[PDB]
Amino acid sequence: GGFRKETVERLLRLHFRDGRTRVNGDALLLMAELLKVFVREAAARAARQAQAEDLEKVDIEHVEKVLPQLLLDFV
Amino acid sequence: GGFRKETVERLLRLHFRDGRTRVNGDALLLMAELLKVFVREAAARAARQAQAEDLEKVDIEHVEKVLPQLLLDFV
Amino acid sequence: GGEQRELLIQRLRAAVHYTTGCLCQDVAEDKGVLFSKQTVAAISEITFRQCENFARDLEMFARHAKRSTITSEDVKLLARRSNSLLKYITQKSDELAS
Amino acid sequence: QRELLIQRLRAAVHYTTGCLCQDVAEDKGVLFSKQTVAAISEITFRQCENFARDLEMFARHAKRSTITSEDVKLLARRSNSLLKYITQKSDELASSN
Numbered sequence: 001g002g003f004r005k006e007t008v009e010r011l012l013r014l015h016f017r018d019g020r021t022r023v024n025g026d027a028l029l030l031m032a033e034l035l036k037v038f039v040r041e042a043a044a045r046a047a048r049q050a051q052a053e054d055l056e057k058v059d060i061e062h063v064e065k066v067l068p069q070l071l072l073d074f075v
Numbered sequence: 076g077g078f079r080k081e082t083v084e085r086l087l088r089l090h091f092r093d094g095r096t097r098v099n100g101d102a103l104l105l106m107a108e109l110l111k112v113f114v115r116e117a118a119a120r121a122a123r124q125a126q127a128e129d130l131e132k133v134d135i136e137h138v139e140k141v142l143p144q145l146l147l148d149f150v
Numbered sequence: 151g152g153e154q155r156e157l158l159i160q161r162l163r164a165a166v167h168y169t170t171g172c173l174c175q176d177v178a179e180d181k182g183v184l185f186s187k188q189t190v191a192a193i194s195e196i197t198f199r200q201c202e203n204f205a206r207d208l209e210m211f212a213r214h215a216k217r218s219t220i221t222s223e224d225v226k227l228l229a230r231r232s233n234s235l236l237k238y239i240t241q242k243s244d245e246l247a248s
Numbered sequence: 249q250r251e252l253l254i255q256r257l258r259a260a261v262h263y264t265t266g267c268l269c270q271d272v273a274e275d276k277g278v279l280f281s282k283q284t285v286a287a288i289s290e291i292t293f294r295q296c297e298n299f300a301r302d303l304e305m306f307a308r309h310a311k312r313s314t315i316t317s318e319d320v321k322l323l324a325r326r327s328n329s330l331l332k333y334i335t336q337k338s339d340e341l342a343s344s345n
Contacts, residue, residue: 002169002172002173003166003169004165004169007162007165007166007169010158010162011162011166011198011201011205012201012204012205012208012220013205014158014159014162014201014205015201015202015205015206015209016205016209017206017209018209018213018218020218021209021212021218021219021220022218022219022220023208023219023220024219024220024221024222026221026222026243026246026247027208027220027221027222027224027225029246030222030225030226030239030242030243030246031204031208031225033239033242034204034225034228034229034239035197035201035204036173037235037238037239038197038200039169039170039173039174039193039197040173040176040177042193042196042197043173043174043177043178043185043193044177044181046185046189046193047177047178047181047183047185048181050183051181051183055183056182056183056184057183057184057185057186058178058183058184058185058186058189059186059188059189060186060188060189060192062189063189063192063193063196064192067196068143068144068147069143070196071147071200072143072146072147073231073232074200074203075146075147075150075203075231075326076264076267076268076270076271077264078261078264079260079264082257082260082261082264085253085257086257086261086293086296086300087296087299087300087303087315088300089253089254089257089296089297089300090296090297090300090301091300091301091304092301092304093304093308093313095313096304096307096313096314096315097313097314097315098303098314098315099314099315099316099317101316101317101338101341101342101344102303102315102316102317102319102320104341105317105320105321105334105337105338105341106299106303106320108334108337109299109320109323109324109334110292110296110299111264111268112330112333112334113292113295114264114265114268114269114288114292115268115271115272117288117291117292118268118269118272118273118280118288119272119276121280121284121288122272122273122276122278122280125278126276126278130278131277131278131279132278132279132281133278133279133280133281133284134281134283134284135281135283135284135287137284138284138287138288138291139287142291146295147326148326148327148330149295149326149327149330150326203326206325207325210322210325211309214306214309214310214318214322215309215310215311216310223309227305227309230301230302230305231298231301231302
């Protein structure tokens, strides 16, 4: 139904700068949720941008168009 | 050129949601400094875009072109 | 050597690509559109990349509180700028541990 | 009242922005239109809402009602160069004595 705890943990560990850093179990589940929301937002806004153009197929242009606002919204 | 600590403090207080919230002295001075870097970075990037366009004059279009990325690095 | 990290990176990219594919499949049904394989892949790459900022922030938000272990409090702080999202994630969290 | 306060602060930011842009103009050998300076001033004014609310939340995160250099450094965390610059300014201040 979404991202796996182990995938999310590995994803984060990839970027930690401190060898001390750990993540508790519920933070992981919560983060898996947040990552799910972000993918689905990326997808919906790209979709949104496409049928706004009266197109049923979403292309990389639609993705590119909605990208800046999507990222600002997750800052 | 620079922001006065009194201006900076009133700017922040405008938006504080908690009545307890305060700013210490060094933080005010640091924030003034951050606000000034922000302005200069905005101006410099807009100047850089205009020059890339082979222009000696910076217009609002140059500002709006650089804004999304700028907001990406001042988060 | 360094190629271990690179293999780990292609692994994680591929795992994110699969889940992204799954999630995009759902959105394409609700919205009744089609997501080109190129689009799914791009959304996946973006998402993978975005984990760099999430991770950096979680780590620093916890450290800010003098904590080595990231908690649900840190993850909620990630959602602060958005009241609807914060509420969603806040709700998710209380829906979790309970 | 609050609205007059807002117009006061917009005007003060706008004036200070004018000064900074003149510095960048000369240094870079470009001219900034009045509208450009206006636009930058307004962006900066709007940004403060986020800066303020983040700082407040960053301090509350650490259980503090008072915002400190630490919170400000955190605000600069996204750019490595920016974080480096603010940090240095932070360190100069703390060394005040």
